[PDB]
Ligand binder design. Structure first.
Ligand SMILES: O=P(O)(O)O[C@H]1[C@H](OP(=O)(O)O)[C@@H](OP(=O)(O)O)[C@H](OP(=O)(O)O)[C@@H](OP(=O)(O)O)[C@H]1OP(=O)(O)O
Ligand SMILES: [Mg+2]
Ligand SMILES: [Zn+2]
Lengths: 167, 569, 347
RNA sequence: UCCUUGAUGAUGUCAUACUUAUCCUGUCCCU
């Protein structure tokens, strides 16, 4: 609701934010409409963070609906945290996240080799999402002030206005 | 000179080349994997060339030409600086666009089953141009229709009632998540099917009989280097699509067929009912080499790659085929050699000028002996008469209109052409008749010489109105000999007419009491007399070939003599 | 089809492609609607007019460009700037799918292409030395006449003694563009000229230089006799000089061998190919890219260097007396009396 | 019961010559 109230206050009726936080144009845009509707790293960071959380919460919703499993929930969460850079696309709008992404890959190499040891083969079957969970919460610990400042200046420019030659 | 050279210390006019790197190139190929291992990183399979040998690249017709020499304003080369790189980026596209090379969000491409990892600069334009005008949907519904029409002709060999094509929403071809049903079968009593297996498996029929219901699905993927194993893909999509709730099938006892557009691989995984796996094998093998939509795919890929090939073509009639001329099919020879014929004369200024003469289209049956002579009058050449080239198109148009007027019983199965330039117009003008195979001949025939006969020439030169005239060049031969004996006799006669054209007439008419009939072309002889004149015309062919090539005919082997007389070595 | 009455006449409007096939030619942007309810359903303006058989037809008739027509339009001025990411040349190409200006596509194709091709061809025909009914056409350098090809002699000082040419009647621009009936008759003149120069103690080198195939140059098949003590050293010169021709780090692997493959099934229909054949044995061929690092002569220069001739012969020629010195045709015609195969009226 | 100033066949029609939303990339002629 927040992201498309930001869309509808900017009168960008030709954009559409779907329910999985993919922003697509409804029609084919002119040059003026395309320059008007270019967003920045604040909007797309908030949109991709909300994509990651909706992936997590929907995994839990399909567990709570009776659709999936306990074990398949654990392995789905372990995939989500091992593959944020492949499921979301947060890296495009802040690149330093590769530091986190590679780290999760390293943990996936550390855990699986200890997990797939004996009779257990190379199937999916491994939900040990504590490590990737810690890595993506420690990311959020530092991305909270950066995004609060960026979204604050975004809202302040939308509601106060831009100061042309003020600074 | 403002340019700096690194070869400042030598010159090849004086010192020579001083380095040679062909051993380097040779074991560079052998180190990368060989040509076979290199070309699996490429779209070579998507071009569907049989071999790689005579492939020539063609940077002479790209955008870097007459325009882009003097475009000027070098800020042009700021957005359009990646346009020389497009062809390259197309060619190695199964390795640029991998999962394991770009860790990325991996969006789907527009109306395709193509996924683009990352934001490769010119790849998306190339993929839009190759799948221009809804080619995924047309490829999918052309394969569904082909497999249905395969099932529309094998009813009373299997247990059937009626195959039925679902008209589902069109937006299922480019949907990797789930599918619906590409055809539904309707068996008479029951099918004890087998179990799920592959398309290239051997045996083992078994479990439950599942009356009236049988589905196939058709999945078109766009493989990359990492994932183009079509069998593992087919079984994975089967086990995912049959055991989920988003995709619900009529029966649990059907097959899906996976086709990789990038590599031209195909396979299947499902419940095979008896006498269907060796049917679908032959069917899919036929469809992967005759489908007109895959043809547009392949030609658009080659088109975008600008990559050509002399040495392979469609497989000709060249030498070893020719026994297949005399099967139970309707085969035509078409010859347009004498269509646009010209005679040159001098004017009062002295300068030589060109006036046309009436031509003909030579259609011959090599399995009955029936002839179609289409006399092409001068009054269709009112409109160019300086260069020609519309000869090919008027010939193809008249052959197409003749097959159009001809009943469906005598329609050809193969049309075998003497001049290869006709292979492309007929292929256009016979799109109304898809079952006609058009095949070229390396084996050149003397069918131009048939109009050297006085009856044909006096018919053509004195005409003033286009007419279709019928003949039989096997005059009464089929009462005693076979079609191929009569055909080899006719090739001997026409070749001897092409070589000397008068000594053949003297030898075939040595006596006034030897006669010929007005219903027929050649004199009436008993079979011993035919053996005599066949040996004589064989001598006329061989002696003049040896004279034109400074060789003796008493040393030539039987295969060499056959190649001299019948075709060309 | 199209008519276009060129100053009195009638010409059937046709287009040639790369492969030399000749097809009959039948006869503010509004940003159409390249979506639906929220979903994209077509890219260009005519993705629902074309059927599958129509795509097969337009793939066969369609010339081998399809990138160039779009890149010409989106290369021009007043058209923004690719700002790195978020607006590349990819989505610029998606945005340029306008609604072409009421058969303006067929108009530009027909008018540009048909008229341009005809205009160029007419000019070439008018000033062609060959194609009998032309303007220049010496007409006394004719020695032979065949069914479809003829011998000629060059209009200039003629590099060697029995220098001759094998020219077809019509413009055909290549040997790979020839039909088999013309090609088998060029091979008969070739096998007769070899037998004429072999009994005279000479040797034969048959050149075929085919430059860029869109300026419509007439086909001419060289024949340059040089003495046998120099023609046994002739594949060495051409083998050295083909590989020290064209743009280094080329693609197509220079010096195609033609020992038993005889360019008809060696070089694809469409792309330039210099070729040289030594007598009756086929020699070499070189697919030409980069039309500036390869001279339009190239063969008379190698032959003219191994015979130590001045460069005014091979480039630009030296003219002769317009009837008097050009009666080497008289000398050539008494050479080509025993080896004439084009007549039988010699009673 | 007002009110303000002039530059030597013309005028019209038809024909000929000179520049494109539009693009292609270069050769003649005599001793
Ligand atoms: O293809 P491999 O080199 O053998 O590696 C794969 C890959 O892991 P890496 O990313 O570390 O290479 C898979 O993940 P992705 O390919 O999807 O990134 C992973 O499975 P997940 O997808 O579940 O991570 C899989 O693990 P496994 O084979 O145990 O299922 C693992 O193979 P290895 O485990 O043999 O390294
Ligand atoms: Mg700018
Ligand atoms: Zn000409």
């Amino acid at each position: 609701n927040m992201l498309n109230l930001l869309i509808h206050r900017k009168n960008l009726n030709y954009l559409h934010l779907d329910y999985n936080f993919n922003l697509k144009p409804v029609k084919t845009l002119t040059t003026k409409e395309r320059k008007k509707s270019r967003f920045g790293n604040a909007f797309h960071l908030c949109r991709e963070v909300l994509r990651l959380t909706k992936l997590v919460v929907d995994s839990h919703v399909q567990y709570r609906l009776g659709n999936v499993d306990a074990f398949q929930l654990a392995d789905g969460l372990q995939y989500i945290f091992a593959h944020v850079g492949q499921l979301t696309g947060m890296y495009r709008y802040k690149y330093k996240l590769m530091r986190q992404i590679r780290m999760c890959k390293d943990l996936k190499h550390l855990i699986y080799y200890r997990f797939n040891t004996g009779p257990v083969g190379k199937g999916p079957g491994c939900g040990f999402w504590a490590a990737g969970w810690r890595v993506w919460l420690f990311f959020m610990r530092g991305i909270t002030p950066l995004l609060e400042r960026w979204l604050g200046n975004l809202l302040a420019r939308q509601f106060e206005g831009r100061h042309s030659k003020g600074v | 000179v403002l340019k700096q050279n690194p070869f400042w210390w030598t010159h090849q006019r004086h010192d020579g080349k001083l380095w040679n790197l062909n051993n380097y190139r040779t074991d560079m190929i052998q180190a990368l994997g060989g040509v076979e291992g290199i070309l699996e990183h490429t779209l070579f399979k998507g071009t569907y060339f049989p071999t790689w040998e005579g492939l020539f690249w063609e940077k002479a017709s790209g955008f870097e030409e007459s325009m882009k020499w003097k475009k000027l304003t070098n800020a042009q080369r700021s957005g359009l600086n990646q346009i020389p790189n497009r062809r390259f980026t197309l060619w190695w596209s199964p390795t640029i666009n991998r999962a394991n090379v770009y860790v990325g969000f991996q969006v789907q491409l527009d109306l395709t089953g193509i996924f683009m990892h990352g934001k490769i600069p010119t790849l998306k334009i190339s993929l839009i141009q190759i799948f221009r005008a809804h080619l995924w949907q047309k490829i999918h519904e052309s394969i569904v229709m082909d497999l249905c029409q395969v099932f529309d002709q094998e009813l009373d060999a299997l247990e059937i009632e009626t195959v039925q094509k679902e008209t589902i929403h069109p937006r299922k071809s480019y949907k990797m998540n789930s599918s619906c049903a590409d055809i539904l079968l309707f068996a008479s009593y029951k099918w004890n099917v087998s179990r799920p297996s592959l398309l290239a498996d051997s045996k083992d029929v078994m479990d439950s009989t599942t009356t009236q219901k049988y589905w196939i699905d058709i999945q078109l993927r766009w493989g990359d280097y990492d994932s183009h194993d079509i069998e593992r893909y087919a079984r994975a999509k089967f086990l995912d699509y049959t055991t989920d709730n988003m995709s619900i099938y009529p029966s649990p006892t059907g097959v899906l067929i996976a086709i990789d557009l990038a590599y031209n691989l195909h396979s299947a995984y499902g419940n095979w009912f008896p006498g269907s796996k060796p049917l679908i094998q032959q069917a899919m093998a036929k469809i992967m080499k005759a489908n007109p939509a895959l043809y547009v795919l392949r030609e658009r890929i080659r088109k975008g790659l600008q990559l050509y090939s002399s040495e392979p073509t469609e497989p000709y009639l060249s030498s070893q085929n020719y026994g297949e001329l005399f099967s139970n099919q309707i085969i035509w020879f078409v010859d347009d050699t004498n269509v646009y014929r010209v005679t040159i004369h001098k004017t009062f200024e002295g300068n030589l000028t060109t006036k046309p003469i009436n031509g003909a289209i030579f259609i011959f049956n090599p399995r009955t002996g029936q002839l179609f002579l289409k006399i092409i009058h001068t009054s269709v050449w009112a409109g160019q008469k300086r260069l020609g080239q519309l000869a090919k198109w008027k010939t193809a148009e008249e052959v197409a209109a003749l097959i159009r007027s001809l009943p469906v019983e005598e329609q050809p199965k193969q049309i075998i052409v003497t001049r290869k330039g006709m292979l492309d117009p007929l292929e256009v003008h016979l799109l109304d008749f898809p079952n006609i195979v058009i095949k070229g001949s390396e084996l050149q025939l003397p069918f131009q010489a048939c109009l050297k006969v006085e009856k044909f020439g006096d018919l053509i030169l004195k005409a003033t109105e286009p007419q279709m005239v019928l003949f039989n060049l096997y005059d009464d031969w089929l009462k005693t000999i076979s079609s191929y004996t009569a055909f080899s006799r006719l090739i001997l006669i026409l070749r001897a007419l092409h070589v000397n054209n008068d000594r053949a007439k003297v030898i075939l008419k040595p006596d006034k009491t030897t006669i010929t009939e007005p219903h027929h072309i050649w004199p009436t002889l008993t079979d011993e007399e035919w053996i005599k004149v066949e040996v004589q015309l064989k001598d006329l062919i061989l002696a003049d070939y040896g004279k034109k090539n400074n060789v003796n005919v008493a040393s030539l082997t039987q295969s060499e003599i056959r190649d001299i007389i019948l075709g060309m070595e | 089809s199209g008519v276009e009455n060129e100053d009195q006449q009638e010409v059937i409007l046709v287009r040639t492609d790369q492969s030399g096939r000749v097809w009959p030619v039948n006869t503010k942007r509004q940003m159409v609607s390249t979506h639906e309810e929220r979903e994209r359903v077509r890219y260009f303006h005519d993705d629902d007019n074309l059927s599958l058989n129509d795509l097969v037809k337009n793939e066969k008739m369609g010339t081998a460009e399809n990138q160039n027509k779009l890149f010409m339009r989106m290369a021009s001025k007043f058209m923004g700037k690719t700002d790195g990411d978020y607006y590349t040349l990819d989505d610029m190409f998606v945005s340029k799918a306008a609604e072409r200006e009421r058969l303006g596509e067929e108009e530009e194709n027909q008018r540009k292409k048909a008229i341009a091709e005809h205009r160029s061809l007419a000019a070439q025909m008018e000033k062609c030395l060959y194609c009998f009914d032309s303007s220049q056409f010496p007409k006394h350098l004719i020695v032979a006449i065949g069914v479809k090809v003829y011998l000629c002699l060059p209009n200039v000082r003629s590099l060697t003694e029995g220098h001759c040419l094998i020219v077809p009647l019509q413009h055909h621009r290549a040997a790979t563009l020839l039909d088999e009936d013309i090609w088998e008759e060029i091979q008969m003149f070739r096998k007769s000229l070899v037998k004429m120069f072999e009994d005279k103690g000479l040797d034969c080198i048959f050149l075929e230089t085919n430059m860029s195939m869109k300026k419509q140059y007439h086909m001419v098949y060289e024949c340059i006799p040089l003495p046998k003590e120099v023609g046994d050293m002739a594949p060495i010169y051409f083998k050295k000089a083909i590989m020290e021709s064209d743009e280094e780090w080329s693609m197509n692997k220079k010096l195609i061998d033609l020992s038993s493959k005889d360019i008809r099934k060696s070089v694809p229909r469409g792309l330039p190919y210099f070729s040289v054949d030594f007598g009756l044995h086929g020699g070499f061929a070189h697919v030409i890219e980069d039309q500036h690092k390869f001279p339009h002569y190239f063969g008379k220069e190698i032959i003219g260097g191994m015979l130590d001739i001045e460069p005014r012969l091979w480039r630009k020629g030296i003219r002769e007396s317009f009837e008097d010195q050009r009666k080497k045709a008289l000398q050539f015609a008494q050479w080509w009396k025993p080896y004439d195969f084009t007549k039988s009226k010699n009673y």
